[PDB]
Design a protein that fits this description.
homotrimer; alpha+beta; Pdz3 Domain; 6 strands
Chain lengths: 84, 84, 84
């Protein structure tokens, strides 16, 4: 079931890495850095699937693009996710 | 026609994503984040082609390398671009 | 011979890029940004091979993953390296 979550990163990384599952095509949260922005929010966890970032769907994009959107965004950031 | 532009990013992302066009080989600005460093400069736009970053030519490099140069650089950053 | 080094990056990039050597499989430091965190430490140099980041071995991971770990980490960061 798809959930909307929102957190803030300012002058700090998101603190999360992603990996595309090559069999399912899912973009999955692979790692949460301890004490980073993602971790402190308590809203996003290893195994969660990313569906959208700031209203941008992933489903038609390559990982290299999605990883840049996570890195190049600033301030409040919305994710639509399927929780693990 | 190739243009030299210079902007500053300090303790913030560039606020721009790039994508290689697999047919032409061009590295093209794919997205400008609203309110980010790139946007605020007014110097770089979706559809612009990157030719050089800080005097480093792109033309013999893979996207994974160029994306890291954009992320790992700090302070004033020069681009040589072909405007869209 | 493998060396453990530790540096700090906070609200700034690492200031280093990496590239996998497709023949050897090594993850090699390709560039050190002048005045960046990596450069100022004096501990890491072009040609050094990364073996681990914060205790995470590289040897079973893709470059896209390792590059994210470098970018998404904050604060003190440990590397295990083979100096060039």
């Amino acid at each position: 079931s798809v959930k909307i979550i929102r957190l803030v990163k300012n002058r700090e990384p998101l603190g999360a890495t992603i990996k595309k599952d090559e069999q399912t095509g899912a973009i999955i949260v692979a790692r949460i850095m301890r004490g980073g922005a993602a971790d402190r929010s308590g809203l996003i966890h290893v195994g969660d699937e990313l569906r959208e970032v700031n209203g941008i769907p992933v489903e038609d994009k390559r990982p290299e693009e999605i990883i840049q959107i996570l890195a190049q965004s600033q301030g409040a950031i919305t994710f639509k996710i399927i929780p693990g």
